């Protein structure tokens, strides 16, 4: 796997119908319509969490839908209930998603009654399934590359969210996986891995190599900018700093690679071999650190046979200059990405059980 | 002795259709409008051959660039509410709204 994917957090079931049902039965105490009506959605809401956050989950849209729906629908009861004035008896229980080391400090597991760290684990385990989701799919399949551009973005904008409002109606101090640091960087991680989509879109399609070199050179930037956060305060599992380090150098090589071609075209063919240098110094670095984690072996061999027919070309027709790295026009960043804004509904068709109440 | 911004109107849009701004500015779109949820409008688009398709994504950006600049000389100023004015009347014409926020970012460049 190139792609970085997120494992999704476990929680213990909860009786999330008892208190809901007291309240309703305190609220509407000679209302039968509205006692049978509220209370069997309560009892809906408790089988809701049970399906979207009580069982492993399959890599399929229909769990993801689950998944938003239970979001959707807690973001929903908040105000209808008295959660604020802390009135409502309901303790989640969640576990870090990075099960790594030794288990010591006792927060691998996190019980806290709030509404608020629920809504922020939920939203976790709908970026971490997009993400899994995103990295299940057959990149050299059209359809496959939309679904992975589709569910990165997604995966980056909910992840972001949890960053800017997890402290805010926390009270103690997050597990790692949820704090800000910690989504900030998996946030940029796919968002990075989303503009990769955009790039094998481009290559996929044989468009311009212009565009090209423009797509992998802002994913060069993201996967830098992940990898300069990932190295400060390393939490995550220890695949991650090697995989972006690797993306870095990659995208830095293929936007280099397709500007070298522009450069041919354009008869600038000592500025062709110079980029080709710089694709090849690059994954020199990549082949020689991260063997482990990416096989940039075909990518290595197609850089080396451009360069040497560049330069027997050159050597003996064009005599062309082969310019300083400094003196080449920067390739310029073309962004196709948007971390995607969590606006309840993020779900379906989504119907508030709580509507009438 | 055309306005100011008439004249920069007319700059871009040559550039659109002679030049690589143009050639970028179709690609950008094409890639945005393939990969946003499907519409009748966006698999049409799709579906369409690339000098067919480029042509219209070029004359649809023209149309934009025009309807957004279309002032007197004071609207070239605060330019980010003429954004605010449009977008909203195109959250059920998804593909023109595409359209519509690339030609605002060409446009921005020259009039900021």
Same mark, same amino acid.
Request: charged share 25%.
């Given at each position: 796997?190139?792609?970085?994917?997120?494992?999704?957090?476990?929680?213990?079931?909860?009786?999330?119908?008892?208190?809901?049902?007291?309240?309703?039965?305190?609220?509407?105490?000679?209302?039968?319509?509205?006692?049978?009506?509220?209370?069997?959605?309560?009892?809906?809401?408790?089988?809701?969490?049970?399906?979207?956050?009580?069982?492993?989950? /399959?890599?399929?849209?229909?769990?993801?839908?689950?998944?938003?729906?239970?979001? /959707?629908?807690?973001?929903?009861?908040?105000?209808?209930?008295?959660?604020?004035?802390?009135?409502?008896?309901?303790?989640?229980?969640?576990?870090?998603?990075?099960?790594?080391?030794?288990?010591?400090?006792? !927060?691998? +597991?996190?019980?806290?009654?709030?509404?608020?760290?629920?809504?922020?684990?939920?939203?976790?385990?709908?970026?971490?399934?997009?993400?899994?989701?995103?990295?299940?799919?057959?990149? /050299?399949?059209?359809?496959?590359?939309?679904?992975?551009?589709?569910?990165?973005?997604?995966?980056?904008?909910?992840?972001?969210?949890?960053?800017?409002? &997890?402290?805010?109606?926390? !009270?103690?101090? #997050?597990?790692?996986?949820?704090?800000?640091?910690?989504?900030?960087?998996?946030?940029?991680?796919?968002?990075?891995?989303?503009?990769? &989509?955009?790039?094998?879109?481009?290559?996929?399609?044989?468009?311009?190599?212009?565009?090209?070199?423009?797509?992998?050179?802002?994913?060069?930037?993201?996967?830098?900018?992940?990898?300069?956060?990932?190295?400060? +305060? /390393?939490?995550?599992?220890?695949?991650?700093?090697?995989?972006?380090?690797?993306?870095?150098?990659?995208?830095?090589?293929?936007?280099?690679?397709?500007?070298?071609?522009?450069?041919?075209?354009?008869?600038?063919?000592?500025?062709?071999?110079?980029?080709?240098?710089?694709?090849?110094?690059?994954?020199?670095?990549?082949?020689?650190?991260?063997?482990?984690?990416?096989?940039?072996?075909?990518?290595?061999?197609?850089?080396?046979?451009?360069?040497?027919?560049?330069?027997?070309?050159?050597?003996?027709?064009?005599?062309?200059?082969?310019?300083?790295?400094?003196?080449?026009? #920067?390739?310029?960043?073309?962004?196709? &990405?948007?971390?995607?804004? &969590?606006?309840?509904?993020?779900?379906?068709?989504?119907?508030?059980?709580?509507?009438?109440? | 002795?055309?306005?100011?911004?008439?004249?920069?109107?007319?700059?871009?849009?040559?550039? =659109?259709?002679?030049?690589?701004?143009?050639?970028?500015?179709?690609?950008?779109?094409?890639?945005? =409008?393939?990969?946003?949820?499907?519409?009748?409008?966006?698999?049409? =688009?799709?579906?369409? *051959?690339?000098?067919?398709?480029?042509?219209?994504?070029?004359?649809?950006?023209? *149309?934009?660039?025009?309807?957004?600049? *279309?002032?007197?000389?004071?609207?070239?100023?605060?330019?980010?509410? *003429?954004?605010?004015?449009?977008?909203?009347?195109?959250?059920?014409?998804?593909?023109?709204?595409? =359209?519509?926020?690339?030609?605002?970012?060409?446009?921005?460049?020259?009039?900021?």
């Amino acid at each position: 796997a190139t792609f970085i994917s997120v494992q999704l957090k476990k929680t213990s079931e909860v009786d999330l119908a008892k208190p809901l049902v007291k309240f309703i039965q305190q609220t509407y105490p000679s209302g039968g319509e509205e006692q049978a009506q509220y209370c069997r959605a309560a009892e809906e809401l408790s089988k809701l969490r049970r399906a979207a956050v009580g069982r492993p989950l /399959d890599k399929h849209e229909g769990a993801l839908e689950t998944l938003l729906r239970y979001y /959707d629908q807690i973001c929903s009861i908040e105000p209808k209930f008295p959660f604020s004035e802390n009135q409502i008896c309901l303790t989640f229980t969640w576990k870090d998603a990075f099960d790594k080391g030794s288990l010591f400090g006792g !927060s691998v +597991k996190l019980a806290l009654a709030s509404l608020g760290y629920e809504k922020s684990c939920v939203l976790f385990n709908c970026a971490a399934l997009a993400s899994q989701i995103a990295a299940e799919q057959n990149l /050299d399949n059209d359809e496959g590359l939309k679904i992975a551009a589709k569910h990165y973005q997604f995966a980056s904008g909910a992840f972001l969210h949890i960053k800017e409002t &997890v402290l805010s109606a926390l !009270s103690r101090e #997050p597990t790692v996986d949820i704090s800000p640091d910690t989504v900030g960087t998996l946030s940029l991680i796919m968002l990075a891995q989303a503009q990769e &989509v955009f790039f094998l879109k481009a290559t996929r399609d044989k468009m311009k190599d212009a565009i090209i070199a423009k797509l992998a050179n802002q994913a060069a930037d993201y996967f830098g900018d992940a990898f300069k956060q990932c190295q400060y +305060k /390393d939490t995550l599992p220890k695949e991650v700093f090697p995989v972006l380090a690797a993306k870095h150098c990659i995208m830095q090589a293929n936007a280099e690679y397709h500007q070298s071609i522009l450069a041919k075209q354009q008869k600038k063919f000592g500025e062709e071999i110079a980029r080709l240098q710089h694709a090849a110094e690059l994954i020199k670095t990549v082949a020689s650190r991260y063997d482990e984690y990416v096989n940039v072996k075909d990518f290595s061999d197609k850089i080396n046979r451009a360069l040497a027919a560049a330069k027997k070309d050159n050597d003996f027709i064009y005599h062309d200059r082969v310019p300083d790295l400094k003196d080449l026009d #920067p390739i310029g960043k073309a962004t196709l &990405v948007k971390s995607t804004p &969590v606006n309840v509904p993020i779900s379906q068709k989504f119907t508030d059980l709580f509507e009438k109440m | 002795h055309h306005h100011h911004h008439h004249h920069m109107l007319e700059t871009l849009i040559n550039k =659109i259709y002679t030049g690589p701004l143009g050639e970028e500015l179709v690609q950008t779109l094409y890639l945005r =409008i393939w990969a946003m949820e499907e519409t009748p409008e966006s698999l049409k =688009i799709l579906q369409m *051959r690339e000098d067919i398709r480029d042509q219209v994504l070029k004359m649809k950006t023209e *149309r934009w660039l025009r309807t957004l600049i *279309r002032g007197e000389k004071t609207k070239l100023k605060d330019f980010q509410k *003429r954004y605010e004015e449009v977008h909203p009347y195109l959250m059920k014409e998804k593909v023109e709204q595409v =359209i519509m926020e690339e030609a605002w970012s060409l446009a921005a460049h020259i009039v900021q």
